[PDB]
Amino acid sequence: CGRVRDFVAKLANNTHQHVFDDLRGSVSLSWVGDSTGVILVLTTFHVPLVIMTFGQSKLYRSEDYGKNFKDITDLINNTFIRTEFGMAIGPENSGKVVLTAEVSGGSRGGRIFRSSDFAKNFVQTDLPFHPLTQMMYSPQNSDYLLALSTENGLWVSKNFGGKWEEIHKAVCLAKWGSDNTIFFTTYANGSCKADLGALELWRTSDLGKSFKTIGVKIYSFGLGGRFLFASVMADKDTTRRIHVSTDQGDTWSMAQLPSVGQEQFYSILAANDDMVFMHVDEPGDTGFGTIFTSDDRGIVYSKSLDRHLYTTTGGETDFTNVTSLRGVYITSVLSEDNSIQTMITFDQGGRWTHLRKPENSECDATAKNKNECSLHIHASYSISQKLNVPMAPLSEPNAVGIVIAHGSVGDAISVMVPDVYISDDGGYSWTKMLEGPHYYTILDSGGIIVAIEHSSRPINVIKFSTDEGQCWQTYTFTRDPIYFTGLASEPGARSMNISIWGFTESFLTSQWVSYTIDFKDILERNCEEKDYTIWLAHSTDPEDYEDGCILGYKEQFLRLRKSSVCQNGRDYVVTKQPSICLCSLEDFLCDFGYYRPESKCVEQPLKGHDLEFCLYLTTNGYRKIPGDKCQGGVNP
């Protein structure tokens, strides 16, 4: 360990300073498209008084991954941009930026500045309304925009915000579906807060020319992968139930899920083409609830995890899709003793379990036994309680296996200052990566992991690893230390450019600055076929025939070798071959009406929300797990 020599030379010329405006202003960063290098930076000075009197927005634009910027404030004339709305960037490489300008007193509608050539040219456009929300793009067409007004009217544009037309008047919530469909709720007599529970859900397939009332007595709605969800109030009651439609609200079916009071809430934790994870808050503001995984129809729900930590009103939950490995999800749970623990599922919420203790760790003060304990992960709740946690867990799909996160090693989540931990196998095994809290980033699909220390002092050092966090080279990137604020790499983790943001120590003033580093010379050579190695995902018992079967299949990957030092590339694709396992009874979840004593699904004599689902239809008592792809073997 410590392999590399003369790396300082290879990074010195590739480090790129850029000073911006002083700390009298506030910076806001936004990327525009993949493989572009196009970053926008909006400096904003505001001294807010009784009315608008002083304020200045400047706009900068890079196109070399943030190494150099050109001032483009002239392209928005001399206009103040409202940060609240932000930089509405279009999907894909559409190159469609839209800013929202402040307007004078008594103006009938607001103003926007909009480019569609990666911020090379903007054009001014006065609106017929004052917008309330940021302008949502349609995913199918980047020229199609919806926006909500300050008078609750839903406006739509076909020509990239050039001309707008009010499709409907009394709109609360609205969002795009597939094929340019617009689902939205609307009120009748009183406002959204008052009419909450007696709203009605509308649909338009043709940009508001035609309409269809797809639901009534609505609390709210949501889109989750293939499914359309709607919370619906029980008539002559304050309770509500979740209803589901797979055909854009033409036909509905009530979900096999409990009804909830007004104190409680449902939450779409995660959703794909296969299934949904649904949180249901336990009544009486207890601060937890219950995860339910759906079937492929989104209708029958198995109870996945009890006592799931989710704070009141929503907002805070530690539920984390580990994107670097299939079927893996980490979250936090409350104990009976009121201590928070971290559970991991490897089979999409079939079985949950504690995380394995890392090799290079002692068990902390929370642990009963000094030698035997588990890993616990800091995420959104830890951050909300103001613990010394600079980042939530990080994983990238293209960096297969890699999960980086802060944590504590014991019987529960500890208030003490955490170290950073890494798994290279999607969270089966763990290791202490770095000592004390850091900010972290994955570059080149795992080829380089980068880390900056979280410090009250200013800093001038960046730690990097070419062998997935086992060995760490330390690089001094500036002679003048900075108070670090954040990192910015290109989304997708395919770049080799990291931008270290912060502000200077106090001289005449303090000023915003970004040191951008390219690692292209550190990984001078591209990776050949010899650099990769065969890796079975989910391996427990290598000698076993069913080893690595999760949702009825295995996956053998071509992972990059740790010792190998090379660029994966931008064009890099995750090479994997699946092995289809034989079906067992474990590959089938129990259909409605059936359960497991012990493991075989057997009918039940029906209480609670089961009885309600039965009353308000035909089955052998088994159904295939959604996304389960086993063939042959057991079959009821």
């Binding site: 202003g25 709210s220 709605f221 969800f229 809430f265 939450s267 939950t317």
Partner: peptide
Amino acid sequence: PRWDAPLRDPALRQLL
């Protein structure tokens, strides 16, 4: 002052 690098498509949890 303030520093923000927001995500374009942040997967906010839908409530019902």
